[PDB]
């Protein structure tokens, strides 16, 4: 009785947010982007096939130098590749083979991993000993670790399966702040290019935008009907696309605070495992788990291309910082560098 | 070639890394990956007591020159849909069922008894899309406590239609047939049912005999003989 009348406020507040949708109901993204020149038919070919894992790859991350790559598979190894050659720069044996995420530092000196072991292990690459050692074990989560992303050598945002995210400190080993408010298990996250905000998505079909210094949710986005498991920012930073299990991608805007465009097709079921943007955000690369990635037009909602070529489902995906190539790693033992 | 000495030594290092990865994969392919699943109160830790925080516990053990890795994942308490596909490719699933909890209920969630929850979990993991062809080593623990409890309380508390007496053997066969009939994939999957006793080197003997059979049958499927 005491809470229910609060619900009488609260859903009404949501209706006010819906009334805020009437503040931004003048037009859609398709109406503004009419009579524009399309990107056209895209035939980008695989160039490298990074063949050194022996189980299914769950994550990859490019380097900021756009040549190094990192990958984590469901065997106990995490391999750092040269992409120009096909050279394994490193191979790190892991304490637990159940890793679902990995990250590559912008400085390039550290890598991260995590998964069912609830620990974001940080490994120091550049060292005087010559071999990669465990720099810092970041324990403290209770759910399964789902995403990790670096800010610098000391800050890292980890989203786990305990419906919370956390920003940590490498030297202290403890959480600087905890982001709370999702009701389902948190699956993905993405930082802005100016790293002031990051938007993260969970299994409750809600994408929440957080500030790294405030520690609280700024904006909340809804419109999916299944577990959101992929989020990538626009390179401008004022918008972000997401992908979930309903085989639809959605482009939300931070300023409009609503969904702009929906990317879907009639013959596509078996939804998205990973999304990314190209340079200038014109193409949306979505890795669907009917074994292939699709190139959608971010302004025309048209399927420009198909990146089929993986024998199993494209778990992980990523575009280089200069946009030279896109890597897709799948649930066979293989990464592929499409260009 | 157009490598020069630095990139030639770099591809030599990558070849050494390839060799170490191949040796590590051959060492890891000698292990048998098993998954412990259950309601939690089934006494599967007692199974850990019979074979010999983090969300996954690995119970490495050996029996007759064969090494088993047993993955207890029931302490995760998360949504099982988003991380059970990590375990697609285990050799078998060791589902543990408490026989003595046929009449015991849990009133915290929805007041229903624990055996219907265990049967719901068995229907969820047997008919999963990832465990289409991974056989189940079903274990029925606490048989003596179940016998001492069915000496007083009959089986009709759990099952509304049980046309049998209070004999331990007939009720155990009825429970085994009820758990086996949740298999909708009987052509591509078998269920190995055992009653957990206090005799040493017999539950692990059942696991070893079940795992050799599923390895033989999976090899006969993979080589085209089946």
């Amino acid at each position: 009785s005491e809470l229910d009348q609060l619900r009488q406020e609260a859903e009404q507040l949501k209706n006010q947010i819906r009334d805020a949708r009437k503040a931004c109901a003048d037009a859609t993204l398709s109406q503004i982007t009419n009579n524009i020149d399309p990107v056209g038919r895209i035939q980008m070919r695989t160039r490298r096939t990074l063949r050194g894992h022996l189980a299914k790859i769950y994550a990859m991350h490019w380097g900021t130098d756009s040549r190094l790559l990192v990958s984590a598979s469901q065997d106990g190894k995490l391999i750092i590749w040269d992409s120009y050659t096909t050279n394994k720069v490193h191979a790190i044996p892991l304490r637990s083979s159940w890793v679902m995420t990995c990250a590559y530092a912008p400085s390039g000196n550290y890598v991260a991993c995590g998964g069912l072991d609830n620990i974001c292990s940080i490994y120091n690459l550049k060292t005087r000993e010559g071999n990669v050692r465990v720099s810092r074990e970041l324990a403290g989560h209770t759910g399964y670790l789902s995403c990790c992303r670096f800010l610098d050598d000391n800050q890292i945002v980890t989203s786990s399966g305990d419906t919370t995210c956390a920003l940590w400190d490498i030297e202290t080993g403890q959480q600087t702040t905890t982001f709370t408010g999702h009701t389902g298990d948190v699956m993905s996250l993405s930082l802005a290019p100016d790293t002031r905000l990051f938007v993260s998505g969970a299994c409750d079909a809600s994408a929440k935008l957080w500030d790294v210094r405030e520690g609280m949710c700024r904006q909340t986005f809804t419109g999916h009907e299944s577990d959101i498991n992929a989020i990538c920012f626009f390179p401008n930073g004022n918008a972000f696309a997401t992908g979930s299990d309903d085989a639809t991608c959605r482009l939300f805007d931070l300023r409009a605070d609503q969904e702009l465009m929906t990317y879907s097709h009639d013959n596509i079921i078996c939804g998205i495992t990973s999304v990314s943007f190209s340079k200038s955000g014109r193409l949306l690369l979505a890795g669907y788990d009917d074994f292939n990635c699709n190139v959608w037009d971010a302004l025309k909602a048209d399927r420009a291309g198909v990146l089929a070529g993986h024998d199993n489902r494209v778990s992980c995906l990523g575009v280089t910082d200069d946009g030279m190539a896109v890597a897709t790693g799948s649930w066979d033992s293989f990464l592929k560098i499409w260009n | 070639c157009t490598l020069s000495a630095e990139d030639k030594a770099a591809v030599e290092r990558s070849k050494m890394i390839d060799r170490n990865l191949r040796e590590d994969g051959e060492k890891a392919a000698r292990e048998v990956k098993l998954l412990l699943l259950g309601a939690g109160e089934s006494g599967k830790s007692t199974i850990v007591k019979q074979m010999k925080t983090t969300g996954i516990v690995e119970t490495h053990f050996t029996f007759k020159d064969l090494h088993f890795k047993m993955f207890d994942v029931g302490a995760q308490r998360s949504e099982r849909k988003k991380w059970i596909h990590c375990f697609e490719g285990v050799t078998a699933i060791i589902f543990c069922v408490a026989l003595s909890d046929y009449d015991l209920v849990l009133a915290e969630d929805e007041e229903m008894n624990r055996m219907h929850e265990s049967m719901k979990l068995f229907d969820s993991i047997c008919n999963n899309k990832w465990f289409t062809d991974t056989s189940i080593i079903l274990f029925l623990n606490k048989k003596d406590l179940f016998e001492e409890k069915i000496k007083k309380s009959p089986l009709t508390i759990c099952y509304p239609e049980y046309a049998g007496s209070n004999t331990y053997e007939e009720a155990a066969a009825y429970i085994q047939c009820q758990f086996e009939d949740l298999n909708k994939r009987k052509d591509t999957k078998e269920i190995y049912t055992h009653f957990t006793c206090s005799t040493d080197t017999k539950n692990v003997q059942f696991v070893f005999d079940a795992v050799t059979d599923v390895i033989i049958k999976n090899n006969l499927k993979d080589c085209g003989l089946f």
Partner: single-chain antibody
Amino acid sequence: VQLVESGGGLVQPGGSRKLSCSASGFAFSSFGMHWVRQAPEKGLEWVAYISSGSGTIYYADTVKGRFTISRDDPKNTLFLQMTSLRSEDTAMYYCVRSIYYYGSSPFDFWGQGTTLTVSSGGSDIVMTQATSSVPVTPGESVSISCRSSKSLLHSNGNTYLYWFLQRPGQSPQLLIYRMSNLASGVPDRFSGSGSGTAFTLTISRLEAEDVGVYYCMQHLEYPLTFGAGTKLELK
């Protein structure tokens, strides 16, 4: 990270001598090993090289047919079997570790050295240094130029030139690897530049620890040839 040599001393010409370089504090089996000798009042010269896991063994012109280099990875010790020594082998042998991947820093550590003395009885790249002794002053900018007979630029964009500083009484220390990258422990005042065949090493705000001999070494293809040796002296 230690590289301690032993077994050196005075030997007869034509005799046999073995040098054992003990490595500790780092992974020995993942590091390619080199032998660099240095005669008194001379420069550095590469002798022999064995890679990680003994995959590749190289020898120089005066080394092939006479020497034998091997490693013991469980023992973490580098060996050098020398047969039929001559008067030109009287030099200070340095045990050098090296690693090779993308972004690595090869020749990043040198041993303390051992003394070998012998009593009395080619389509290569030649490193050219204009002046072997430049009198410098502290607080100014110092420019050191080295040349090569062949262009060190390759198809991958890497220009394989190195800079080594050998302080008196101390092992040589790597300063700049691949002409533009600062090594570990080297301060930010050191810089390098070059274009294909012409090279420029710039030292700004020279201090008391920058005194020593400067060497330029190529790494385009074996055999590895060091420079003549430029020594910077105060006043």
